[PDB]
Amino acid sequence: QRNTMSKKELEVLSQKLRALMPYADSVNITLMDDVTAAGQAEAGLKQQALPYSRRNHKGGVTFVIQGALDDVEILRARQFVDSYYRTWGGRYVQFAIELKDDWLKGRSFQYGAEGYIKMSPGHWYFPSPL
Amino acid sequence: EDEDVTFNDISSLSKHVDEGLDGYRDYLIKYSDRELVQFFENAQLKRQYGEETETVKRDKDEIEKPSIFALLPAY
């Protein structure tokens, strides 16, 4: 989808790659599907049962994995991502992994569009919509 | 000694009296040590079976809350 070239241009590209690689006899160019790539990524995360969020951009997909993961989860995730990267590389799909503590450190809060954080009984923060 | 106001109700009188002791209450709270004061406060109330753990530490302008009957021994 994201490349627009003629057959002649592709051949020229092939020949220039062949000039960069003096040990190769020819370079075969194959067209792959972005939807396939993204789908195999999401299928792998479901198969590993990891919690995640997905974000789409004009030229990429980002999977955000964040929170208090357990050591089994961290092991599985590291193995899966390491396998995927070796197949598809890192240009199109990115995996963001973030260990972090529970949100707002165990204060209580009102999470509507008019939310606020209790600092302590008798003390309101009103920092941002939550 | 000012008779300048006369009192509509229990709470109005009670507050008028209370606000008079603060000159003394200040002097006691200046020199006692708050951790006792709080310990006694929590003790004369029967609260949570008299002593329990606190996960969180949260200070609530405790200077104006504390009863004189709590302040005196600490001093």
Side-chain angles (χ1 to χ4, degrees), chain B residues 21-33:
Chain B
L21 306 180
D22 292 330
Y24 193 56
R25 180 184 263 128
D26 160 79
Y27 166 93
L28 301 188
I29 191 56
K30 181 176 175 202
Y31 292 102
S32 59
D33 304 329

mmCIF file with all atom_site columns, all heavy atoms in Angstrom, chain B residues 21-33:
data_model
loop_
_atom_site.group_PDB
_atom_site.id
_atom_site.type_symbol
_atom_site.label_atom_id
_atom_site.label_alt_id
_atom_site.label_comp_id
_atom_site.label_asym_id
_atom_site.label_entity_id
_atom_site.label_seq_id
_atom_site.pdbx_PDB_ins_code
_atom_site.Cartn_x
_atom_site.Cartn_y
_atom_site.Cartn_z
_atom_site.occupancy
_atom_site.B_iso_or_equiv
_atom_site.pdbx_formal_charge
_atom_site.auth_seq_id
_atom_site.auth_comp_id
_atom_site.auth_asym_id
_atom_site.auth_atom_id
_atom_site.pdbx_PDB_model_num
ATOM 1   N N   . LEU B 1 21 ? -10.400 30.474 75.025 1.00 0.00 ? 21 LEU B N   1
ATOM 2   C CA  . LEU B 1 21 ? -9.290  29.672 75.536 1.00 0.00 ? 21 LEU B CA  1
ATOM 3   C C   . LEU B 1 21 ? -8.073  29.611 74.619 1.00 0.00 ? 21 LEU B C   1
ATOM 4   O O   . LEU B 1 21 ? -6.990  29.231 75.073 1.00 0.00 ? 21 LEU B O   1
ATOM 5   C CB  . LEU B 1 21 ? -9.779  28.260 75.811 1.00 0.00 ? 21 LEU B CB  1
ATOM 6   C CG  . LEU B 1 21 ? -10.990 28.209 76.733 1.00 0.00 ? 21 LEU B CG  1
ATOM 7   C CD1 . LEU B 1 21 ? -11.419 26.782 76.953 1.00 0.00 ? 21 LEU B CD1 1
ATOM 8   C CD2 . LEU B 1 21 ? -10.673 28.871 78.046 1.00 0.00 ? 21 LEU B CD2 1
ATOM 9   N N   . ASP B 1 22 ? -8.225  29.908 73.335 1.00 0.00 ? 22 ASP B N   1
ATOM 10  C CA  . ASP B 1 22 ? -7.116  29.747 72.402 1.00 0.00 ? 22 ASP B CA  1
ATOM 11  C C   . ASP B 1 22 ? -5.829  30.454 72.806 1.00 0.00 ? 22 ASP B C   1
ATOM 12  O O   . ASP B 1 22 ? -4.748  29.979 72.458 1.00 0.00 ? 22 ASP B O   1
ATOM 13  C CB  . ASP B 1 22 ? -7.547  30.219 71.026 1.00 0.00 ? 22 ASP B CB  1
ATOM 14  C CG  . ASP B 1 22 ? -8.591  29.323 70.427 1.00 0.00 ? 22 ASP B CG  1
ATOM 15  O OD1 . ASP B 1 22 ? -8.576  28.117 70.745 1.00 0.00 ? 22 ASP B OD1 1
ATOM 16  O OD2 . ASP B 1 22 ? -9.417  29.809 69.634 1.00 0.00 ? 22 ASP B OD2 1
ATOM 17  N N   . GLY B 1 23 ? -5.888  31.538 73.566 1.00 0.00 ? 23 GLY B N   1
ATOM 18  C CA  . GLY B 1 23 ? -4.640  32.119 74.036 1.00 0.00 ? 23 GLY B CA  1
ATOM 19  C C   . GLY B 1 23 ? -3.843  31.195 74.941 1.00 0.00 ? 23 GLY B C   1
ATOM 20  O O   . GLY B 1 23 ? -2.613  31.220 74.930 1.00 0.00 ? 23 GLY B O   1
ATOM 21  N N   . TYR B 1 24 ? -4.531  30.375 75.730 1.00 0.00 ? 24 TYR B N   1
ATOM 22  C CA  . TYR B 1 24 ? -3.921  29.332 76.553 1.00 0.00 ? 24 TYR B CA  1
ATOM 23  C C   . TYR B 1 24 ? -3.558  28.110 75.721 1.00 0.00 ? 24 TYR B C   1
ATOM 24  O O   . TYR B 1 24 ? -2.474  27.527 75.875 1.00 0.00 ? 24 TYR B O   1
ATOM 25  C CB  . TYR B 1 24 ? -4.863  28.962 77.695 1.00 0.00 ? 24 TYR B CB  1
ATOM 26  C CG  . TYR B 1 24 ? -4.222  28.128 78.770 1.00 0.00 ? 24 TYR B CG  1
ATOM 27  C CD1 . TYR B 1 24 ? -3.086  28.559 79.418 1.00 0.00 ? 24 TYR B CD1 1
ATOM 28  C CD2 . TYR B 1 24 ? -4.770  26.921 79.156 1.00 0.00 ? 24 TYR B CD2 1
ATOM 29  C CE1 . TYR B 1 24 ? -2.502  27.804 80.397 1.00 0.00 ? 24 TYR B CE1 1
ATOM 30  C CE2 . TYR B 1 24 ? -4.191  26.163 80.135 1.00 0.00 ? 24 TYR B CE2 1
ATOM 31  C CZ  . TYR B 1 24 ? -3.061  26.610 80.753 1.00 0.00 ? 24 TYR B CZ  1
ATOM 32  O OH  . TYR B 1 24 ? -2.479  25.848 81.729 1.00 0.00 ? 24 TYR B OH  1
ATOM 33  N N   . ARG B 1 25 ? -4.482  27.699 74.860 1.00 0.00 ? 25 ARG B N   1
ATOM 34  C CA  . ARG B 1 25 ? -4.279  26.518 74.035 1.00 0.00 ? 25 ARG B CA  1
ATOM 35  C C   . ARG B 1 25 ? -3.029  26.670 73.188 1.00 0.00 ? 25 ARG B C   1
ATOM 36  O O   . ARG B 1 25 ? -2.261  25.716 73.023 1.00 0.00 ? 25 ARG B O   1
ATOM 37  C CB  . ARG B 1 25 ? -5.492  26.320 73.139 1.00 0.00 ? 25 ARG B CB  1
ATOM 38  C CG  . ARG B 1 25 ? -5.417  25.141 72.229 1.00 0.00 ? 25 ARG B CG  1
ATOM 39  C CD  . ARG B 1 25 ? -6.624  25.095 71.320 1.00 0.00 ? 25 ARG B CD  1
ATOM 40  N NE  . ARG B 1 25 ? -7.662  24.197 71.812 1.00 0.00 ? 25 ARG B NE  1
ATOM 41  C CZ  . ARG B 1 25 ? -8.941  24.525 71.974 1.00 0.00 ? 25 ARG B CZ  1
ATOM 42  N NH1 . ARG B 1 25 ? -9.365  25.756 71.740 1.00 0.00 ? 25 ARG B NH1 1
ATOM 43  N NH2 . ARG B 1 25 ? -9.798  23.620 72.416 1.00 0.00 ? 25 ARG B NH2 1
ATOM 44  N N   . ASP B 1 26 ? -2.790  27.867 72.668 1.00 0.00 ? 26 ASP B N   1
ATOM 45  C CA  . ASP B 1 26 ? -1.559  28.124 71.939 1.00 0.00 ? 26 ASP B CA  1
ATOM 46  C C   . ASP B 1 26 ? -0.348  27.832 72.800 1.00 0.00 ? 26 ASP B C   1
ATOM 47  O O   . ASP B 1 26 ? 0.614   27.208 72.347 1.00 0.00 ? 26 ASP B O   1
ATOM 48  C CB  . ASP B 1 26 ? -1.508  29.569 71.492 1.00 0.00 ? 26 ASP B CB  1
ATOM 49  C CG  . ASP B 1 26 ? -0.106  30.003 71.180 1.00 0.00 ? 26 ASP B CG  1
ATOM 50  O OD1 . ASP B 1 26 ? 0.400   29.671 70.090 1.00 0.00 ? 26 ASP B OD1 1
ATOM 51  O OD2 . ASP B 1 26 ? 0.514   30.643 72.054 1.00 0.00 ? 26 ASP B OD2 1
ATOM 52  N N   . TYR B 1 27 ? -0.338  28.352 74.016 1.00 0.00 ? 27 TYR B N   1
ATOM 53  C CA  . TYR B 1 27 ? 0.845   28.232 74.853 1.00 0.00 ? 27 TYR B CA  1
ATOM 54  C C   . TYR B 1 27 ? 1.139   26.778 75.187 1.00 0.00 ? 27 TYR B C   1
ATOM 55  O O   . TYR B 1 27 ? 2.298   26.357 75.172 1.00 0.00 ? 27 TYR B O   1
ATOM 56  C CB  . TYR B 1 27 ? 0.639   29.059 76.114 1.00 0.00 ? 27 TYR B CB  1
ATOM 57  C CG  . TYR B 1 27 ? 1.603   28.800 77.228 1.00 0.00 ? 27 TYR B CG  1
ATOM 58  C CD1 . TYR B 1 27 ? 2.745   29.555 77.364 1.00 0.00 ? 27 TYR B CD1 1
ATOM 59  C CD2 . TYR B 1 27 ? 1.338   27.847 78.187 1.00 0.00 ? 27 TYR B CD2 1
ATOM 60  C CE1 . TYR B 1 27 ? 3.590   29.371 78.420 1.00 0.00 ? 27 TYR B CE1 1
ATOM 61  C CE2 . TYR B 1 27 ? 2.199   27.635 79.226 1.00 0.00 ? 27 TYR B CE2 1
ATOM 62  C CZ  . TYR B 1 27 ? 3.321   28.399 79.338 1.00 0.00 ? 27 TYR B CZ  1
ATOM 63  O OH  . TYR B 1 27 ? 4.212   28.151 80.341 1.00 0.00 ? 27 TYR B OH  1
ATOM 64  N N   . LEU B 1 28 ? 0.112   25.993 75.496 1.00 0.00 ? 28 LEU B N   1
ATOM 65  C CA  . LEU B 1 28 ? 0.334   24.557 75.692 1.00 0.00 ? 28 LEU B CA  1
ATOM 66  C C   . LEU B 1 28 ? 0.849   23.860 74.435 1.00 0.00 ? 28 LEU B C   1
ATOM 67  O O   . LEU B 1 28 ? 1.767   23.032 74.507 1.00 0.00 ? 28 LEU B O   1
ATOM 68  C CB  . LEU B 1 28 ? -0.946  23.872 76.151 1.00 0.00 ? 28 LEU B CB  1
ATOM 69  C CG  . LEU B 1 28 ? -1.570  24.360 77.450 1.00 0.00 ? 28 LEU B CG  1
ATOM 70  C CD1 . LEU B 1 28 ? -2.706  23.446 77.823 1.00 0.00 ? 28 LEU B CD1 1
ATOM 71  C CD2 . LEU B 1 28 ? -0.548  24.427 78.554 1.00 0.00 ? 28 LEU B CD2 1
ATOM 72  N N   . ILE B 1 29 ? 0.283   24.184 73.271 1.00 0.00 ? 29 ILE B N   1
ATOM 73  C CA  . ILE B 1 29 ? 0.678   23.493 72.049 1.00 0.00 ? 29 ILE B CA  1
ATOM 74  C C   . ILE B 1 29 ? 2.048   23.922 71.569 1.00 0.00 ? 29 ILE B C   1
ATOM 75  O O   . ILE B 1 29 ? 2.687   23.202 70.801 1.00 0.00 ? 29 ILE B O   1
ATOM 76  C CB  . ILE B 1 29 ? -0.381  23.710 70.950 1.00 0.00 ? 29 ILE B CB  1
ATOM 77  C CG1 . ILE B 1 29 ? -0.142  22.803 69.748 1.00 0.00 ? 29 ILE B CG1 1
ATOM 78  C CG2 . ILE B 1 29 ? -0.389  25.138 70.493 1.00 0.00 ? 29 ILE B CG2 1
ATOM 79  C CD1 . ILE B 1 29 ? -0.080  21.342 70.058 1.00 0.00 ? 29 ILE B CD1 1
ATOM 80  N N   . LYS B 1 30 ? 2.524   25.074 72.004 1.00 0.00 ? 30 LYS B N   1
ATOM 81  C CA  . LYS B 1 30 ? 3.868   25.485 71.636 1.00 0.00 ? 30 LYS B CA  1
ATOM 82  C C   . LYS B 1 30 ? 4.927   24.580 72.237 1.00 0.00 ? 30 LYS B C   1
ATOM 83  O O   . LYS B 1 30 ? 5.987   24.396 71.636 1.00 0.00 ? 30 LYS B O   1
ATOM 84  C CB  . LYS B 1 30 ? 4.110   26.921 72.075 1.00 0.00 ? 30 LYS B CB  1
ATOM 85  C CG  . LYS B 1 30 ? 5.469   27.433 71.719 1.00 0.00 ? 30 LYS B CG  1
ATOM 86  C CD  . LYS B 1 30 ? 5.606   28.881 72.082 1.00 0.00 ? 30 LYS B CD  1
ATOM 87  C CE  . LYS B 1 30 ? 7.010   29.371 71.837 1.00 0.00 ? 30 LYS B CE  1
ATOM 88  N NZ  . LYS B 1 30 ? 7.307   30.582 72.639 1.00 0.00 ? 30 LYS B NZ  1
ATOM 89  N N   . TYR B 1 31 ? 4.687   24.037 73.423 1.00 0.00 ? 31 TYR B N   1
ATOM 90  C CA  . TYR B 1 31 ? 5.726   23.358 74.180 1.00 0.00 ? 31 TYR B CA  1
ATOM 91  C C   . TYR B 1 31 ? 5.515   21.864 74.355 1.00 0.00 ? 31 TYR B C   1
ATOM 92  O O   . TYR B 1 31 ? 6.495   21.148 74.542 1.00 0.00 ? 31 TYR B O   1
ATOM 93  C CB  . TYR B 1 31 ? 5.868   24.003 75.556 1.00 0.00 ? 31 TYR B CB  1
ATOM 94  C CG  . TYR B 1 31 ? 6.421   25.397 75.471 1.00 0.00 ? 31 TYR B CG  1
ATOM 95  C CD1 . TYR B 1 31 ? 5.598   26.494 75.597 1.00 0.00 ? 31 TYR B CD1 1
ATOM 96  C CD2 . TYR B 1 31 ? 7.760   25.615 75.261 1.00 0.00 ? 31 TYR B CD2 1
ATOM 97  C CE1 . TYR B 1 31 ? 6.093   27.759 75.525 1.00 0.00 ? 31 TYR B CE1 1
ATOM 98  C CE2 . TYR B 1 31 ? 8.263   26.883 75.186 1.00 0.00 ? 31 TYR B CE2 1
ATOM 99  C CZ  . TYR B 1 31 ? 7.425   27.951 75.321 1.00 0.00 ? 31 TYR B CZ  1
ATOM 100 O OH  . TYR B 1 31 ? 7.920   29.226 75.246 1.00 0.00 ? 31 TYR B OH  1
ATOM 101 N N   . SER B 1 32 ? 4.286   21.360 74.299 1.00 0.00 ? 32 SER B N   1
ATOM 102 C CA  . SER B 1 32 ? 4.115   19.911 74.301 1.00 0.00 ? 32 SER B CA  1
ATOM 103 C C   . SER B 1 32 ? 4.592   19.311 72.980 1.00 0.00 ? 32 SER B C   1
ATOM 104 O O   . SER B 1 32 ? 5.027   20.012 72.068 1.00 0.00 ? 32 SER B O   1
ATOM 105 C CB  . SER B 1 32 ? 2.657   19.552 74.546 1.00 0.00 ? 32 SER B CB  1
ATOM 106 O OG  . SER B 1 32 ? 1.834   20.121 73.552 1.00 0.00 ? 32 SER B OG  1
ATOM 107 N N   . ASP B 1 33 ? 4.550   17.979 72.892 1.00 0.00 ? 33 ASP B N   1
ATOM 108 C CA  . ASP B 1 33 ? 5.038   17.244 71.729 1.00 0.00 ? 33 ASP B CA  1
ATOM 109 C C   . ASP B 1 33 ? 3.906   16.437 71.109 1.00 0.00 ? 33 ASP B C   1
ATOM 110 O O   . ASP B 1 33 ? 3.350   15.542 71.752 1.00 0.00 ? 33 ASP B O   1
ATOM 111 C CB  . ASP B 1 33 ? 6.191   16.328 72.125 1.00 0.00 ? 33 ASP B CB  1
ATOM 112 C CG  . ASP B 1 33 ? 7.322   17.081 72.779 1.00 0.00 ? 33 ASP B CG  1
ATOM 113 O OD1 . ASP B 1 33 ? 7.516   18.265 72.434 1.00 0.00 ? 33 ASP B OD1 1
ATOM 114 O OD2 . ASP B 1 33 ? 8.014   16.495 73.637 1.00 0.00 ? 33 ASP B OD2 1
#
